[PDB]
Amino acid sequence: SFETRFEKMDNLLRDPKSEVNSDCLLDGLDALVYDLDFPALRKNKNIDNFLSRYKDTINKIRDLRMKAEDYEVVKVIGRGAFGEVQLVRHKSTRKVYAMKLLSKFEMIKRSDSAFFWEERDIMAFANSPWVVQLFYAFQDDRYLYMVMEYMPGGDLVNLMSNYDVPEKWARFYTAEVVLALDAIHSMGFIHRDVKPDNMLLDKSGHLKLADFGPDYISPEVLKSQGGDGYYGRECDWWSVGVFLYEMLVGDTPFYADSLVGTYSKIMNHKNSLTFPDDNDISKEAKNLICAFLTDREVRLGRNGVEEIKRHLFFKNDQWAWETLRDTVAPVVPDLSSDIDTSNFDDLEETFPIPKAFVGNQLPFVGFTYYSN
Amino acid sequence: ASFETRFEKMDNLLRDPKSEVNSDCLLDGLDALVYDLDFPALRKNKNIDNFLSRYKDTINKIRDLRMKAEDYEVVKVIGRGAFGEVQLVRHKSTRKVYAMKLLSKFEMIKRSDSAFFWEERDIMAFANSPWVVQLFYAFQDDRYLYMVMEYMPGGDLVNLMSNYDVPEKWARFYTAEVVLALDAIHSMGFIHRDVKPDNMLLDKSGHLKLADFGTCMKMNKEGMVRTPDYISPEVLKSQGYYGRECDWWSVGVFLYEMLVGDTPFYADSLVGTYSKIMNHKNSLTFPDDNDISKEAKNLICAFLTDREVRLGRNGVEEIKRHLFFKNDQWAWETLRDTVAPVVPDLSSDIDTSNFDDLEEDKGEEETFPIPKAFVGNQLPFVGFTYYS
Ligand SMILES: CN(CC(=O)N1CC=C(c2c[nH]c3ncccc23)CC1)c1ccccc1
Ligand SMILES: CN(CC(=O)N1CC=C(c2c[nH]c3ncccc23)CC1)c1ccccc1
Numbered sequence: 001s002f003e004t005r006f007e008k009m010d011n012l013l014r015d016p017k018s019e020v021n022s023d024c025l026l027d028g029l030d031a032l033v034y035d036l037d038f039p040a041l042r043k044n045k046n047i048d049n050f051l052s053r054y055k056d057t058i059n060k061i062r063d064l065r066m067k068a069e070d071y072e073v074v075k076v077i078g079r080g081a082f083g084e085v086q087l088v089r090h091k092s093t094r095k096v097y098a099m100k101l102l103s104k105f106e107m108i109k110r111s112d113s114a115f116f117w118e119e120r121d122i123m124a125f126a127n128s129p130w131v132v133q134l135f136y137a138f139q140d141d142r143y144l145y146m147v148m149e150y151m152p153g154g155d156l157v158n159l160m161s162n163y164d165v166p167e168k169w170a171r172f173y174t175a176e177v178v179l180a181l182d183a184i185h186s187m188g189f190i191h192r193d194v195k196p197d198n199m200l201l202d203k204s205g206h207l208k209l210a211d212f213g214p215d216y217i218s219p220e221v222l223k224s225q226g227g228d229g230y231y232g233r234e235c236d237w238w239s240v241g242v243f244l245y246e247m248l249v250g251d252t253p254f255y256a257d258s259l260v261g262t263y264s265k266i267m268n269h270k271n272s273l274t275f276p277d278d279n280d281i282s283k284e285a286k287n288l289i290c291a292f293l294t295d296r297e298v299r300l301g302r303n304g305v306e307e308i309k310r311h312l313f314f315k316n317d318q319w320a321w322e323t324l325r326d327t328v329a330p331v332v333p334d335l336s337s338d339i340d341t342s343n344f345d346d347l348e349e350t351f352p353i354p355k356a357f358v359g360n361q362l363p364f365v366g367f368t369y370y371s372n
Numbered sequence: 373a374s375f376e377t378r379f380e381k382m383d384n385l386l387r388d389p390k391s392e393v394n395s396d397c398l399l400d401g402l403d404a405l406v407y408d409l410d411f412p413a414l415r416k417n418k419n420i421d422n423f424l425s426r427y428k429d430t431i432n433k434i435r436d437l438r439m440k441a442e443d444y445e446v447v448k449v450i451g452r453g454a455f456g457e458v459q460l461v462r463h464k465s466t467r468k469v470y471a472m473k474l475l476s477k478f479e480m481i482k483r484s485d486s487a488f489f490w491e492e493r494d495i496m497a498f499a500n501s502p503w504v505v506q507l508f509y510a511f512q513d514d515r516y517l518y519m520v521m522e523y524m525p526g527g528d529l530v531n532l533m534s535n536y537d538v539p540e541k542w543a544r545f546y547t548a549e550v551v552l553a554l555d556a557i558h559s560m561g562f563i564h565r566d567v568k569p570d571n572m573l574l575d576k577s578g579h580l581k582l583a584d585f586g587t588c589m590k591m592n593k594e595g596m597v598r599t600p601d602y603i604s605p606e607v608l609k610s611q612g613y614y615g616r617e618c619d620w621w622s623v624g625v626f627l628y629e630m631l632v633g634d635t636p637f638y639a640d641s642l643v644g645t646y647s648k649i650m651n652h653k654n655s656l657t658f659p660d661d662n663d664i665s666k667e668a669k670n671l672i673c674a675f676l677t678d679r680e681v682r683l684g685r686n687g688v689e690e691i692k693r694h695l696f697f698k699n700d701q702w703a704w705e706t707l708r709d710t711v712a713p714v715v716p717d718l719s720s721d722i723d724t725s726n727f728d729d730l731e732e733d734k735g736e737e738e739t740f741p742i743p744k745a746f747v748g749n750q751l752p753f754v755g756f757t758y759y760s
Contacts, residue, residue, distance in 0.1 A: 001465060002443075002463075002465050002466060005437050005438075006759075008437055009434075009437050009438065012430075012434070012437075013395050019426070019427065019430050020399065020402065020430050020434060022386050022395055022398070025395065025398035025399060025401070025402055026386075026393070026398060028398070028401050028402045028405060029393065029398060029401045032401060032405065036748075044747065044748060045484070046747065046748040046749060046751045046752055047748050047751065049487070049751070049752060050748065050751040050752065050754065053392070053755075054392065054393075054754075057385075057392045057393055058393075061382075061385070061393060064378050064381055064382050064385075065378075065382065070375075092374070092375045093375060108419075111418065113419075113422075114422065356745055356746070357745070357746035358417065358419065359409075359417060359419040359420050359423065359746075360419060362419045362420060362422075362423040363419055363422055363423060365423065365427075366426075370379070372379070
């Protein structure tokens with residue numbers, strides 16, 4: 001059938017989850033112009049003629065497509081190894097967002113340029129109240145850009161520093177992390193390193209997970225990094241136990257001065273896991289921490305989220321699992337302005353000119369995403 | 373500007389068939405990149421090897437979904453050229469017969485000639501004229517460019533002129549259809565540069581259409597462009613700047629050959645022909661024993677004259693008003709409705725009686741050397757794909 005094959009082709013060209021969608025195919029042409037336009041390369045007739053034929057329209061497309069210049073940087077609200085997070089405002093729409101930038105130079109230099117694909121897909125397609133949304137994803141020759149919802153409530157590292165977390169609060173945050181992880185697991189993904197930095201609080205003080213691509217890592221994720229083991233969803237449930245312990249105790253359960261010491265304490269969890277002498281912690285809170293901080297064969301979460309939800313630590317009279325997001329969060333942030341950075345602490349290299357085709361833009365083809 | 377205006381202008385560039393960057397040209401770029409990068413020496417670059425792993429699967433899936441040579445069943449080879457051949461083909465699924473023109477990418481790259489086909493592709497795809505051979509689909513693989521066009525079973529006008537003594541009544545019909553065909557091409561901004569009976573094909577009802585635009589060049593904002601019997605004097609002076617009227621000279625040669633039986637500037641030697649063309653004011657003569665009207669002689673002389681005063685240099689309207697076209701069978705708006713002088717008798721949708729059936733070759737699949745660095749041999753063909 002000719003029209004069935006022609007229809008299937010249009011499906012691939014218009015589906016946002018397709019690698020050959022219209023905005024993805026445009027990335028290939030854009031990358032090709034960035035990577036070919038060098039004097040040594042343009043000596044090749046095929047290259048010089050192709051660029052003459054497409055540099056007018058590619059420069060035109062670069063202007064029409066979303067670009068960094070469409071955003072007004074307000075402040076830098078975060079920083080990482082490969083870039084930074086900026087609170088930005090779209091010039092035309094005036095809407096504020098959080099934009100994550102990833103340096104193509106650093107990524108290529110460190111030979112690490114494929115870690116962002118699952119983060120892009122989870123945030124773009126989750127469609128969940130528990131996952132930070134990615135509205136747009138674009139790029140230029142130097143950076144990858146991720147336009148996400150701004151989470152003014154800050155992160156849980158900040159919350160834990162500013163407050164003495166009572167059990168009533170710890171139960172709320174732990175339950176929201178349980179629902180957030182279940183939404184991610186339902187999509188077919190495993191977070192791997194769930195930590196308080198990945199837990200962001202929206203305008204109403206409710207939690208959403210962000211940042212998909214040592215203290216919080218499970219024993220199986222450590223073992224499997226030596227190229228022989230394997231792990232399941234229960235590796236994220238281990239992280240929940242570490243988070244609950246840090247919240248009620250003030251320290252990570254396997255803290256050590258050295259990275260080796262932490263790694264070793266995690267493997268020796270049956271002997272290193274201890275609750276300080278001066279612990280006001282309930283028996284149900286300790287039960288839940290121990291049920292998560294154990295080997296994967298007997299870990300809570302092995303037989304789904306239901307056994308986690310039924311734990312006595314979650315028994316309370318303020319909320320229910322099915323309506324938890326409608327309840328008032330323990331810390332509802334001060335909604336002063338759309339530019340409020342109160343909950344956040346405040347704080348370039350060009351590629352060498354190629355003498356042959358290097359293709360530095362190739363590992364980024366297909367990153368562009370427009371939610372419409 | 374407006375944001376939604378930017379994202380609407382984008383969707384226009386992505387849908388417009390005449391756009392350099394519609395979704396077919398964009399898939400061409402990705403398909404060209406997978407061909408040009410999938411070599412073991414290039415796969416040593418991590419960026420290249422990783423990109424190919426990420427897209428090899430979908431590019432092969434897309435190659436199957438998109439139109440390909442295997443969708444067509446070859447029936448005969450009805451024509452041949454330096455860079456390829458023309459095959460009478462039948463679509464496997466639809467069973468409809470077409471004429472497919474193939475152009476060898478190796479012969480093209482090897483001879484450093486890989487940009488002549490763009491005008492032919494655009495004329496046949498966008499002319500939208502009852503007088504220009506239509507291009508339904510255009511596709512490609514790593515070895516060939518393919519052009520799926522309407523099959524013209526009636527043959528060409530060289531064949532028609534050999535088999536018949538063309539009366540004026542017939543010559544007027546064929547000249548009239550060539551005038552409408554050249555005007556469609558001129559309206560698009562092109563100059564044929566090689567109008568001869570070889571380019572004029574007859575369809576299943578005997579109606580004429582132009583084909584063979586390998587020689588086509590696009591005019592500038594002032595209408596200028598950069599066999600020997602059909603060539604105008606302005607070209608022989610260079611052999612520069614040529615207007616529309618260099619095509620109208622060939623119409624005059626065509627009309628003379630039709631009514632007389634010989635080309636107006638025939639000679640044993642090429643030099644004798646070139647000399648006769650330059651001396652057109654004295655060499656152009658009509659045989660004493662003729663059934664040529666004063667209006668046919670007027671039209672031929674109006675075309676076979678200096679480009680500074682030639683009929684056509686200011687449009688087709690003055691040509692259409694010529695008294696030679698006055699007749700009682702048809703009008704310019706009723707020409708294609710008329711019964712053509714020679715309506716071909718066809719046994720089947722596959723009948724090739726009006727063509728010299730040719731022997732297929734199926735032997736030269738020559739190789740470009742395996743790239744040790746990025747060569748980009750598929751780059752001059754990005755954007756050739758067309759679907760109607
Ligand atoms: C600091 N990171 C971590 C990260 O990947 N993320 C941290 C949290 C995000 C966020 C979403 N919405 C936000 N709203 C207010 C502040 C941060 C955010 C996005 C994800 C980072 C790492 C490497 C290179 C660059 C940045
Ligand atoms: C013979 N040339 C000219 C050519 O390009 N064309 C001549 C013939 C065509 C045709 C359309 N429809 C047809 N139907 C019945 C016969 C021929 C046709 C189309 C155009 C050629 C040159 C190089 C490589 C290959 C062929």
